[PDB]
Amino acid sequence: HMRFGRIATPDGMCFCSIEGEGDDVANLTAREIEGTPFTEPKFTGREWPLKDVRLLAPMLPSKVVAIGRNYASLPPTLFLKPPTAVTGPESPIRIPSFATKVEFEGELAVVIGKPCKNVKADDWKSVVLGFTIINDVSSRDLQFADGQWARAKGIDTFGPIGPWIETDINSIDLDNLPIKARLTHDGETQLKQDSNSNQMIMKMGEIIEFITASMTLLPGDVIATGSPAGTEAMVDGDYIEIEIPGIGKLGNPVVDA
């Protein structure tokens, strides 16, 4: 099945299908569709080289439910990031002056496909539209000061999502999926996160079961399935780029608000 994105246009914006070979934007074509990812696609015929077009968050979720402490001591835990934290590829992560020690977190993100409640673990594939990347940006100093993580992870722009939604969920092997983050600081880039979905303590089905036992999930809701708990701080001028092979890259410049 297809890859679905959203892009700026001159008339505003539109969903598209992303077609072509790599994860590499240079080989890819955005083809405009009418409708959403939730219905049967038909194409208007406007098509762009992906390098020429501005990708947006592939979905504007009613809520983002995130799992803390899910990466190989306290058990995995649920928290929320507000819909206002969500932004897209190349949008600035805008850091307020009072938010310090701000770190990235590359995570595999799941998009819910249909309304669901009390989903059993091995039935999880039936409620998922696809996978995407989220950068669960957090001020570690606020996280610590506040106790509840909501403010430190819920500042506007602290949830980049993208670059598109991969609906072919069998293409993604969850026993071995690298999740990488490359940080550029003072003009140099290093690999600052190197994890793998095989490190997840609660696996995909358990997560969905765990969440939906408590709360109803709606189409377009995003689940952030976790990361290592401490990474590396980012500052004005940096660039952070998460890569999950098979999905693509989610990059964002970092600026002072």
Q: Quick one: what does residue 29 bind among Mg ion, its own copies, none, with the CB cut-off 5 to 8 Å set by partner type?
A: none
Q: Which amino acid, 98?
A: F
- Say if residues 195 and 181 touch (Cβ distance below 8 Å): no
d(CA 132, CA 109): 5
User: Which stretch in 4-12, 20-28, 82-90, 158-166 sits in contact with Mg ion by CB under 5 A?
Assistant: 4-12
Query: Both tokens of residue 99?
Result: 């938010």
Q: Of residues 103, 136, 166, 209, which one binds Mg ion by CB under 5 A?
A: 136
Q: Quick one: what does residue 214 bind among its own copies, Mg ion, none, with the CB cut-off 5 to 8 Å set by partner type?
A: its own copies
Q: Phi/psi at 148 (nearest 5 deg)?
A: -75, 130
Site track 21-60 with its own copies (rule: CB under 8 A), x = hit: ----------------------------------------
180 interacts with its own copies by CB under 8 A? no
- Say if residues 118 and 212 touch (Cβ distance below 8 Å): yes
Residue 8 half-sphere exposure, CB side, CA atoms within 13 Å?
11
Q: Please report the DSSP string for 155-196 in residue order.
A: STT-EEEEEEEE--GGGS-TTS-EEEEEEEETTEEEEEEEEE
User: Which stretch in 118-126, 135-143, 189-197, 233-241 sits in contact with Mg ion by CB under 5 A?
Assistant: 135-143
Q: Of residues 2, 150, 169, 229, which one binds its own copies by CB under 8 A?
A: 150
In angstroms, give the least distance from the CB of 227 to Mg ion. Answer: 5
Site residues (vs its own copies, CB under 8 A)? 62-63, 65, 68, 74-75, 77-80, 82-85, 96, 98-99, 117, 145-151, 154-156, 213-218
